[model samples]
Target chain A: GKRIFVFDTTLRDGEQLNTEEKIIVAKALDELGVDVIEAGFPVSSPGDFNSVVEITKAVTRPTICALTRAKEADINIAGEALRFAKRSRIHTGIGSSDIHIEHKLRSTRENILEMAVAAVKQAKKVVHEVEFFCEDAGRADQAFLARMVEAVIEAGADVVNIPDTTGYMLPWQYGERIKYLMDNVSNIDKAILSAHCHNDLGLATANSLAALQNGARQVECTINGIGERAGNTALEEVVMAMECHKETLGLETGINHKKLVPISHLVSTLMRM
Target chain B: GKRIFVFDTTLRDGLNTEEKIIVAKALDELGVDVIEAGFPVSSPGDFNSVVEITKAVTRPTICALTRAKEADINIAGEALRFAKRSRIHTGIGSSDIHIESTRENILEMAVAAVKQAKKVVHEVEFFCEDAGRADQAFLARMVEAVIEAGADVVNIPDTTGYMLPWQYGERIKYLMDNVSNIDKAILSAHCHNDLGLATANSLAALQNGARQVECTINGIGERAGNTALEEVVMAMECHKETLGLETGINHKKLVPISHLVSTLMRM
Candidate 1:
């Protein structure tokens, strides 16, 4: 069976928790043997940056990660926040889909690809591990997405995240997209592919599983599937799915099954959900 | 796109009193294909609720639930007597863990119930209770037997909510391939949310071969609850192009009816 990495983004995507509460949740994730804990979006606020720094100091086992945009300042700030971690990663990227490039960022495809490569190169300067996310990659053109992913992996991205930002892609569609990148990207083996999906239409778990079956190695999710709008792919649902379908999926995660309920209540209570 | 039948079990699984009548009308207006009014033989109150809902709603098929017992099936038949379109849902345990009698006897009882329901109503739906954990070969046999005995719809329920999407999907697919008379009856998915996978599991069933989804508004039911009506309906709507599936759901009324059920149930 293949070992799957559990990248928990509860602190980064969950409802607002104070610095202390964030540290508690970070320790819980580390105790549960999560491979990565996305601490916070460091450039979002002073408080967020401080939370990231404090969580880096408190948690020991998991790699402490920080979110950033395809900007030098965002990468630098995120790098500064994780200065104390023994294991650290900087997740930084730009939108890859035409909808995001033309409307959201108002940039051309060539410029967006350049920005993604540049961001990965900058993040690599600060940390050994850099994860570049192709926002709304679920809807991105397959050819362009393969090109951007190849460029980022060549530019020093250790992981490439494909996100269903709008929760629009079906399980099979998302799986095909991942398969396309795996087949088309020239430097695909140079970086691990990750799946980050939303639950607006309640297909996030299925979509994430599909990505894993297709080729993805890491799953980015939040506790109780809590996040913006409907929420992110649920950490518990995906982990349990992997555990229950081990015979078929041939995948395993390091999640402590018993601790799930306790930590779930802890996060749910503090988040007041 | 193949059309999926949305069977709302809100009245049967969620509430009672005049509130059920209101919910039934709301579900009918929402374009659901069937409403599981109640377990008619459980009590007089439930029997009367099914009778009243049959009279109040005329668009969707009004279905009454019953056990494999002859009396339960007859009671359900009487309660659905006035429905514009009626169905009697009856079944016995198919899982080894739930079976107290010989598998042969259970199979006989299931067939007899379906035969009896078919005699009373034009449509009969048979459930293989806890089919998620049942042996695939035995389940295929049960489905074949019931369909041969005149079952119109066959429900494969994840009674314990113990299945993953892949496992549940494969189970439905197993029935599709193994059951000889499967095409004679519509395959329905009745999933429980004990593991928060009901919505996903139901969609997987649809992807494999199941055409009817038995769901509740707000996903309210026993234990963790049944599949959420809004989740599965919206899922098909959003991924209609890929899944090539659609339901008769009035997309606009989902939230309104969701609120109506939640508030009336006070949950």
Candidate 2:
């Protein structure tokens, strides 16, 4: 039985709603007891960076995480910006897909693998906690995904984030993919497998549950599956599913399922119209 | 990019009244294009009355449904002799729960009925009864058998409405891909709402490539009854450009027809 740790990615993603609206959304997700609050990118620009700092100061219960590229400048800036929180996570990763390898990173598997490890190593210098995201992890061959996970584990990363970056995997198929890593990756036991899903097929929560069933303890979720395209997994739906299925397999959640609707309503009012 | 198709099954399953003749005229005027005359198998006079309704309906095309039993197909076909245009709908429960209780192999029954219906009529629609609750793999097998038996249309219905919209779509997709001669048959979907997802689930079927829908007015039927034609048609109409479907429905005529059907049935 594994308890669910909800990481709220609203500010980093939800803030994309408009110029002023992201602030209102970030405040709501923070108040909703979202376990991990991903605040923002510090080096985006002066105005955007200020939005992150402003929200980081507002949330009391959540660990504010800042997203940055796998470069020292980005990492150092994120680390410094998120320094005010009681707990902070510095997330960094290189692209993991073959297409990403060829066109984006323009590097060999060995080089990107080193970059994943190096990024975590550098970020760990400032913060003890780190979540290493494997961008496009779903499309990456499981073998390479495993190697990347082992590398991050060696580099002292606390959470190895496996993103369904393209939203390509079926809930069960994607879940099985994460399960495969847990079963096959030699160093998988050393790190926590986190599922960061996109809702291209509207199967994000099902995929999240599938990942959870297979062994991912942490669910990287957005408030209403509100990220890209169809959006990410709806946090309420995922947590509700967990609570419903808890009898078959127990999962600890800090959620009061009854309160989910009211909290969602509150956020919707501010986020909607 | 196919459009949402509306094949009316209101007459077969939509007629919620206790009296049968009212159901017949309801079929004639309910505004649905294709009338699915209910499985009149449960006799001779009942079959004759079906023949009468089939003979009388002028505008809509008609289909008479029967169970998978050979005797059911032969008799149901005879009842359709008076109709201008007709099809024989036949299938049995394909769910493991149904098969185990009935002591019949769903695969064998499906093959037998597909063979029975093809020999009797040019148009044949096979229902994998209670398919909405059938195991995915087995449902595919049943569809393959029925297609091989030459069913012109194959229907997968959630007789129990036990599936979520996604689950229903996934099942239909599995049938389309795995069924051996599936291309020869049109895929029809009938969904129930024991769980309140009948219309939503059926829409999911269209999304997953189910071309024909067996629905009723306001989804009136046996228990939580059938899918409301207006809601399904309206949702599809609203999203037709988005869902990319073509239907026979006059999008604007939805309200008047719905009211007419409701008033006539006095429902």
Candidate 3:
């Protein structure tokens, strides 16, 4: 369709909902014409694993996706959960930023790069679509992000998710990051670039739009922008904006603009937020 | 040094204070370039407050809000009759829904609004309500028409707070690029923080072409309110090298003004 892909993470980023609730939300997202529905992290719990399985059956159009770490076990569980999905994806990656490297992982860059590549290779065997995310990639060194993105794409990743894990970068910096990747990564056309942002500094949507203007094809967001901390990008806001400025931006999404309010209310009521 | 004008619209957008005159004076003391006192014709209370504020504030340019109607411009003009410097801030809706329902012709209506306001005051500011969601061709046409009709400053407001920063910047950039008579007037931004993006959108507007930012202290006003004056000013100061911009605001006075406005508005 040559439209901007709306990848929704409501079930995964939305946090700690029951299997029934996750399935209901996934269905609504599918009805709203989201391109991908991130069902959940399958290995997190049996409840989540079952939620992903249920969502796969519940949604007909949306490609069901499940989150995983750069681990063989997590990827296997995610693959198993999405086994019945007509279309499926396994999202797996490692932290790429220096802070995530030294402080959180206590590991070296060379080791994590191998881990990320191995994970994408493993997931690609299970499904044709694999999305590799560089957690905290916004704060990650630009050259390193490009290297990691190139490595994963070469290893059979269908999509590369560049996330503003801490909501740290301004729109200009974030746009530059996406632009740098587009220019430096030699086999960049092998995979579509995605923007997954947090709202810690209240720039998730802004940063996402910046990334889009600079060539990101997919936007990873949640309903009402609800998620960790300040939350993810608001689906209603971003989708409507693309529709509103479609002519200027030269972008469109398969979103059903009319259903945004109703789905937001459903999620809010179920989550009690 | 490149400068971005800061226009405070707290009194008009955020109301309900026994000390309207006191608040206006504090804003003037804080060196706000323009203080929008109130919409004079909305009510008798609004009319009296605008009169009192225009009389009390001396240094900053006092302003009064009005619709594009003749009655509103006359009422706002009378309220600002005694001020040292004053602006008649008038506006009309520009979105498809607004244009289809309210006005018979968007361009003509906008032209008449500016002509009416200019009749009462030479310093006239015209706002294109819902400019964020308005059609680009029509928005450009309206802005150019108003500027030619004698609008001293033209405001591009994110009335519904529906725009992303990049998109808002694109809109402002479109106007700067396409509007033929754009050089005749200043471009202003009045953003709402509905999706927590007012500051970012306003900053983007400035980065593109907008020279004036319409704000409220502590970001108080309508739903999600307007841009926080302190946030925008501090961001420009903190990232002056990157933004390559500066404002005439006294940095030390931002916090006090924010506290006073929020306290009085109970926000």
Candidate 4:
């Protein structure tokens, strides 16, 4: 059975507390046996940067991750915040969907592709584990998505995050999308395929499993399903599902099931969710 | 292309108010194939809601759930007396523990329920509760027996929410492959979200040949909940190209009714 990595974004997506509280939550995540902790977007604000730094110090076991825009300054800020003991990852990428490009960014798809490559190259200088995400990728063109995913992984992206940012894609569509990448990406063996789904239409958990079944190794989720708009996938739901049905899923996670409820309670208390 | 039946269980599982009459009316407006009003024998309120819903809803089959008891089936028949299209849903456990501890002579219980409901209504749905955990040979025999007993529908429910998607899919596939009279009844999927795989399990069932899906608004049920109506419909819609499936659900009305039920039940 292939190992399913649980990449937790409870700190970044679930972050709404002080530095001390962030430290406590990070410690709890470590104890809960999460494989990686996306602490916070250090480039967002100084408060976020300080929280990321404290989380890196408090969480000794899990790989501490920091988010950044596909910019030099943002990657450097993330690198600085995650500059402690143990493992670290730099998450950086640009928009991929036509909606994001045509209206929001007012930029060409070719330009965004070049920007994503250069950003991954820059972040690889700061950390060995570099995760590249295609914002709004669930709606991105399939041919272009395969091209971008291949390019980033070829440029040393250890993990590639494909997200249903709008939760617009169904389990069937998302599953086929991941399956397409598995078949088309020439260098896919070099990187782990990850699923980061939103819950706008209540399909985050379903889409996440679809991606996993098709070859995605990692799932990105938050506690209590907290995030922007509808929310991200629920960590407890995914963890419990994998643990409870390992036979058919043919996948396993490092999460400590017993600690899920206690840590979820802590997340609710701090975020009031 | 395959036609997937959308079976709504809002009043049965998503019930919390007397406004359930309106809920049933809205479900009919949404083009649902079947609306399971409630278990009439459960309480007087349930009976009243079923009676009201049977009157208020003009389209769609108004279904009333019952145990294997003749009284429950009779009450369900009485509650759905006014519905133009109606079905009596009755069942007993198929798994060893449930059969041994809860009910004896399991096949007889299933046969009796199906026969009793069939006498009252032209359409009868017999559920093999917890079939996911039951032995395949025994479960297959039970299914064939019920179909022979005049059941128009057969439900394979993941009652404990314990099944994985692949296993559940294979279970449905087994029935299609082994049951001699399988084509005599419509195969249904009643999944729970305990393992967070209700939507996935339901989709897998459809992919493997199950024609009807039993779902509730916002996935509300006794525990974690049954499958959510919106999730299953959207999945079928999105994957029409691949699954070659179509549902009668009015897509635009899904969100409004989801909001209505969630707000009404305070869920």
What are the lDDT scores of the predictions, listed in order?
A: 0.87, 0.73, 0.84, 0.85
Candidate 4's docking class is medium
TM-score of the first chain of model 2? 0.92
lDDT of 2 at A45: 78
lDDT of 4 at B193: 89
Kindly report the interface RMSD of candidate 3, rounded to 1 decimal.
Answer: 3.1
List DockQ for all candidates: 0.61, 0.08, 0.31, 0.50
lDDT tens digits, residues B81-154, model 4? 88888899888888887777654453566787788888887589888988998988878888899999999889
Clashing pairs in 4: none
lDDT of 4 by residue, A132-218 (tens): 998787888888888899999988899999998777666767899899999999899988889998877577887888899999999
| Window of ten residues with lowest summed lDDT in model 2 chain B | B12-21
Native-referenced TM-scores of chain A, all candidate models: 0.97, 0.92, 0.96, 0.96
Best by lDDT: 1
lDDT score, candidate 1: 0.87
Model 3: per-residue Cα lDDT over B43-154, one tens digit each: 8888887778877777888888887788788888898888788899988888887777665364467788788888776499999888988889988988988899899999
RMSD for each of the candidates: 1.9, 9.7, 5.0, 3.0
Regions of model 1 farther than 4 Å from truth: none
- Interface C-alpha root-mean-square deviation of candidate 1: 1.8
- In the range B155-225, model 1's lDDT, one tens digit per residue, is 99999897778789999999999999787789999888876778889999999999999998889888889
Instruction: Specify the highest-TM-score model's number.
Output: 1
Range of the 10 consecutive residues with the lowest summed lDDT in candidate 1 chain A? A107-116
